[PDB]
């Protein structure tokens with residue numbers, strides 16, 4: 492088949508969905524593209540390079556709320572960017588595992604830069620802007636990984652038998668959205684406090 | 690060597706530290722214990738069973754702040770339990786990945802039960818108690834996974850070149866502790882609000 496970057500990534504994401512991250516190999520990708528493994532190697536050197544590229548492409552294709560809108564509040568921005576990040580990770584099988592394994596791109600750096608500038612323009616120190624973005628990112632990756640890795644591996648007390656029911660309710664969105672508001676409000680409280688004991 | 694449960698788990702955790710989760714195999718474990726693979730199988734059927742057991746043992750050995758102290762506030766409890774959970778995951782290589790792959794034990798259920806009862810005794814609804822515990826857990830697993838998976842794979846803008854410096858500062862503790870306070874304060878605000886628009 493055609494072996495330009497875009498076509499290779501397309502095939503690899505389709506494979507990812509069929510196999511999961513642990514099952515994804517260059518040998519299967521070559522089979523999927525109708526080529527010998529040495530032909531693939533010219534284009535993609537190893538699994539690591541493949542996954543690095545997938546991780547970037549997934550956000551490039553699907554994380555379309557990475558930047559604030561004209562006039563958006565920083566609360567609203569973090570909320571929107573978290574939801575979008577979440578959706579993008581969930582779009583592919585083991586997507587969050589794919590994401591975790593990566594160090595960031597230059598574009599992601601331009602984008603992260605604009606995000607930190609935005610935060611600091613809104614009254615955050617560099618540190619606190621970064622801490623906030625990091626905590627959203629951690630909380631989001633954590634929740635998706637649990638949603639996703641719940642599937643990988645496949646008699647209860649009053650509250651817990653039922654904790655499990657409350658959860659086997661939707662995909663994880665309610666709990667996710669609820670903790671997200673709690674986090675943002677926490678940041679609010681912090682930012683508003685300035686040097687006052689809080 | 691001796692092949693009681695405890696000895697097998699000990700050897701397996703030591704192997705985990707030498708190999709990481711992806712590198713851990715029953716064949717290496719058997720070599721480490723001085724036995725043939727069919728002998729090991731009697732004791733541990735596969736990698737999956739092995740990892741399930743490790744995940745439980747790691748928290749049993751090292752997550753020693755899983756329950757509130759006499760008279761402890763729920764804020765203080767979540768803070769302490771988060772720090773402890775964090776430390777336990779960090780104690781072994783790929784520890785958070787080990788943890789993620791698991792569904793919980795019966796003991797973890799007794800323990801989680803007591804935690805949800807504690808939360809509800811303090812004024813949380815079941816839902817909100819669960820949402821809070823989940824968000825702490827997600828945020829913590831997220832942060833540790835990034836700390837840890839930062840290692841697995843091994844020119845910057847004013848703020849970001851420096852975002853990276855702020856981070857390459859400690860292990861992740863500062864950012865973690867800071868987001869943890871933000872989360873707890875968010876829960877506080879929520880709980881205190883009752884039915885008032887907040």
Ligand SMILES: [Cl-]
Pocket residue numbers: 492493
């Ligand atoms: Cl073609």
Ligand SMILES: [Cl-]
Pocket residue numbers: 492493494495
């Ligand atoms: Cl081509």
Ligand SMILES: [Cl-]
Pocket residue numbers: 690691
């Ligand atoms: Cl012996």
Ligand SMILES: [Cl-]
Pocket residue numbers: 690691692693
């Ligand atoms: Cl024995």
